[PDB]
Amino acid sequence: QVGVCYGMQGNNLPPVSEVIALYKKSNITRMRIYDPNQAVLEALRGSNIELILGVPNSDLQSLTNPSNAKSWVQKNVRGFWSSVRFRYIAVGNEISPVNRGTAWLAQFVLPAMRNIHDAIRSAGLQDQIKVSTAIDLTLVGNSYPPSAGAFRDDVRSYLNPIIRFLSSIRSPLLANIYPYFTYAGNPRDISLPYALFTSPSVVVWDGQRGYKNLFDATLDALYSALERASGGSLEVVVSESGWPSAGAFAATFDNGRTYLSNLIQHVKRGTPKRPKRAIETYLFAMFDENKKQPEVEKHFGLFFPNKWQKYNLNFS
Ligand SMILES: *[C@@H]1O[C@H](CO)[C@@H](O)[C@H](O[C@@H]2O[C@@H](C)[C@@H](O)[C@@H](O)[C@@H]2O)[C@H]1NC(C)=O
Structure with missing residues (x-):
């Protein structure tokens, strides 16, 4: 099952307790938070929601x-x-x-x-x-x-x-991966269907591997890079992925709905390099976050603040 990132940087979000309820209600069984927020931690008790607990960059030293x-x-x-x-x-x-x-x-x-x-x-x-x-x-x-x-x-x-460290403890590598930003930066060389999982034919031939979408292309490039750096047995957990509904070029409701519905379906299986296994993925993010900068960073929400889904996604 897909997870969803819970960013709290908005002035109009439901109380923590309601967000957890809204996760259970929607059958979202995986959550990522970015700091050890006590309220959220207390609200997840008995929730059966699997958690990515973040250490904030500010606490690393x-x-x-x-x-x-x-x-x-x-x-x-x-x-x-x-x-x-x-x-x-x-x-x-x-x-x-x-x-x-x-x-x-x-x-x-x-x-x-x-x-x-x-x-x-x-x-x-x-x-x-x-x-x-x-x-x-x-x-x-x-x-x-x-x-x-x-x-x-x-x-x-x-x-x-x-x-090397991750290999010795058998941890995956976590990666934030956004075909959106790649596309938005280069719509000239990258086609929208490629970024949206809507391409009927293969778009890129890599020897015997056919790439239909940018996400597969991007993930597999990462796998190849790990392989060159002696991390060829590491699993990758996709720890963010999302498409913004507004705020910039190609940030649209329609693009948003397509990408996320197709992503949820795609990650039940793997990539042309690792075709069998499902790709563990955390969608970014639950709510729009109106305090973030710049403009586009306020529209990654899956839900409006009234708790209605933008896109009507099935998370099961
Ligand atoms: C929430 O998502 C999981 C997948 O991650 C589904 O399996 C859940 O369905 C419930 O559990 C399965 C094992 C089966 O018993 C089914 O009958 C249940 O609905 C899903 N939960 C709901 C309520 O849809």
Whole structure:
């Protein structure tokens, strides 16, 4: 089953308690949060909703201290494990050692991951709670054709031991993946149906592999890059994917409804490189978030604030 990201950065959202109810009501069995919000954590008790618990980028430095990590795991994980189904801990989100926004944080990521995993393991929860980190694909330097997928050379020192770490504890890699932003940036070379899963014929030939949609192309490029960096047995969890209903080029209700309905159907199976297994996917995001910048970042909601679905999606 597909999951949905619960961002809370709006001034008009239902109270936490109602959002959980609305998850249960809609039969959404997986949730991703971006910080260990106590109210949300308390509201998920007995919910049977599988959780991605996020470590905020702002707390990464602090958690490179083992004792600090131990207490974080105690307060935000062990304090709720009776009643909250932790599935992954996302230590950091979209960190890159070469992007201006997060470069000064790259140092902190693996140590935080190690301390958190150690604490989790000390509590004996390591076969239940998988420690990982959530990337964006700015780290992928080349992705066309997908078989040529490779990480940017200037991030290998960062990525290599993290890949290695994930292998030793059998964690997946978490990836935020948005065919929308790719398309919006280059509508000249990328066709809308390709981005929307509506292409009847193959669009890209990669030897014996036919790519019908941008998502498959993009994911498989990631897999190829992992393979070149000795992470060829890692599973990828798609930890965000969404299409905005307004606010910018190609951000439309119709595009939105198509992408998300087709995505939900697509991920029951895999990609041309890994065709069998379902792709675990977290849709971004539950509600529009009117406090975010820029404009387009206010329209990824699946639901209006009156709790009515934009698109009438079946999550079962
Ligand atoms: C919520 O989603 C899951 C899939 O992730 C469905 O299996 C649920 O259906 C219920 O559980 C299955 C095992 C079967 O018993 C079916 O009869 C149930 O409806 C789904 N829940 C609902 C209420 O649709």
